[model samples]
Target: HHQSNCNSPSLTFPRFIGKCDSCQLHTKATNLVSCTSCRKSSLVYEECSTKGCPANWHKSTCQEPKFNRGILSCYCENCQQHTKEKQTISCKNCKNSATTFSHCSSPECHSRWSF
Candidate 1:
């Protein structure tokens, strides 16, 4: 039986095998951000949101991002209260707090993190 098409794209295999071209290309979105001031890709801070790194530590909010997907969204507890923004992605937080892993989901997308 041929199971080629049945496989999911974002599903990660041992040595890197899956249907989701995005996952295979990106290789798992981890805590790209280190701290409120630090970010994984300069492109994110400059392109995604005008706000710089939030007060809280740096981390990925959107669970599993698709290939070529522009932006990943996350709920920033810090930004929510201080910035008055309901949700933030790679944006700067108001108060730097301990980094807690989180994941966001779109209509057809699902978070891939343990948190």
Candidate 2:
């Protein structure tokens, strides 16, 4: 049973997952601001009005807009190093695939893979 209030016990998951219960922003913080207008909570300093809010603001759980700018392509393993035709493939580590591939963006693993 999930309650939609700041005092709900279900709010524990988002906090454990490093997300704000009020705005659903991806970050960990002990201090959060409760918004009556949005019926959500977020970082204390983050905006909480009904008007324009920052991209990270929680307007009923921080909705991140998806802008479709056409299909994104990956650099492919060959292209990340040498100029070659784009070749999409699945990530070797996670077995997950995406339209775009590139040299691993993570500093820990630099292998060529896809998200």
Candidate 3:
């Protein structure tokens, strides 16, 4: 079967043994899983932990699905620097250029960086 978009949240379906024109051809039976809230495949299922959660929250947190919400930013672990839109920034600690900066990968020069 050709699945243009095959997404599932549960992995309870029997192994799929067919030709996937998009993903690939499976000679042997294989299981297919998709996100519950979005059209994305995943290996596990998770329920909403927060009350009054938004519709995209689950897919956003779990599958990292992209949306037109707004610009995304992250913090560096080493130098405690902030970067927007996954842009490269000069590390304050190591003075190195990076695109995806996180505190865990940053130098432990000062207090922990938090959003």
Candidate 4:
């Protein structure tokens, strides 16, 4: 299936998890087994882990769907830095930078890199 303007949080269905160059097809993925043909798939474990291509052309979903945990498990489109301190993450597309997200668990709300 062809997906257009797939976004984070809300539009979370029919996500593409892997690619098969041999078949030239994009395959669906799950938490445990990401793709059937591709061996490189993200685990279905519930530890706030995310993995996928860097092109922002693919999609991903949480095995155990939940929301508002501060640590979102979605792809960051047009992100400049992939790493940051452990404070909090708030990215603004208009601002073109991650806003200062208040730290909930860091030491005295110290600025942290991406976790």
Candidate 5:
């Protein structure tokens, strides 16, 4: 299926995470890079576009059935650092499967990169 105009989670839904950081897919991502300033300001682009790419194409849903309908998972953080093995995760000390989210990939960062 094709997705268009996906966005961040400022609105409301069964599960609305955030928007994906768009970039040129000419190359592949090796490592994830975030900021030393904020917590939920990290992102992983395919190329980072040297500076950044225009948030043009959007897909509300993709092949990942894990996301379900109307559910969109944004880039991990501020920089274009895509996860290689880490994707879905659990929450912190709090267990609220009803309303919960596991942040970031860095368990050392306390999932701070979870954004």
Candidate 6:
């Protein structure tokens, strides 16, 4: 009854395996605001909504997102470092591989990637 979106079961809402690509920041997302991208991977603010994190603690970021696929493409292992391309192979949240990624089709992919 508290964090309904972040504590609910699957099919209702999901919690992603998110984490800062550089730091030990492993959080999840309920929307694009806390999600990831290729060139502009939206860094989780550790607070999704004004009600989630309470504007105090740095641990309640899974609130909302836009997830606007601007016909682009890419990930961390393939796009997070040393790359200059944006190839979103699959931008279908409910139509691709996994349920978690900053913005990928699989659980591993992030923002830009391919087959």
lDDT winner: 2
**lDDT tens digits, residue span 9-44, model 1:** 232212222232332333222322121211111111
Per residue, candidate 3 scores C-alpha lDDT tens digits across 1-44 of 24232222221222345543333433323332323333333221
Runs of candidate 6 with Cα error greater than 4 angstroms are: 1-29, 32-46, 51-72, 75-101, 107-115
Clashes of each: 7, 5, 12, 10, 15, 12
Task: Compose the digit string of candidate 6's lDDT tens values, residues 64-107.
Answer: 33233332334345425432223222223333221222333332
Compared with the true structure, all predictions reach lDDT values of 0.25, 0.30, 0.29, 0.26, 0.29, 0.30
- Winner by lDDT between candidate 6 and candidate 2: 2
RMSD of 1: 16.8
Point to the candidate with the largest TM-score: 3
Model 5, range 9-94, lDDT digits (tens) per residue? 12111222333445444422322333333323333322121223343212222222122112234444633333222332222332
Stronger candidate by lDDT (2 vs 3): 2
Superposed by TM-score, candidate 4 places the C-alpha of residue 103 at a distance from the truth, in angstroms, of: 25
> What TM-score against the true fold does each predicted structure earn?
0.16, 0.17, 0.18, 0.15, 0.18, 0.17
Which regions in candidate 1 have their CA more than 4 angstroms from the true location?
1-31, 36-66, 72-75, 78-115
For candidate 3, give the lDDT: 0.29
Model 4 pairs in collision: 31-44, 32-44, 84-113, 84-114, 85-112, 85-113, 85-114, 86-112, 86-113, 87-112
lDDT measured at residue 67 in model 6 versus the true structure, 0 to 100: 38
lDDT of 4 by residue, 1-115 (tens): 2522212211111233555433334543322312222222222211212334332221343233232223433322333233212222222222212222322222211121122
Error of 5 at 15 (Å): 22
Candidate 2 per-residue C-alpha lDDT over 1-115 given as tens digits, one digit per residue, 9 for 90 to 100: 2423222211110122345445555543333323333234333222222323232333333334222212233443532533222234332433433333222222212222111
> What TM-score does model 2 achieve against the real structure?
0.17
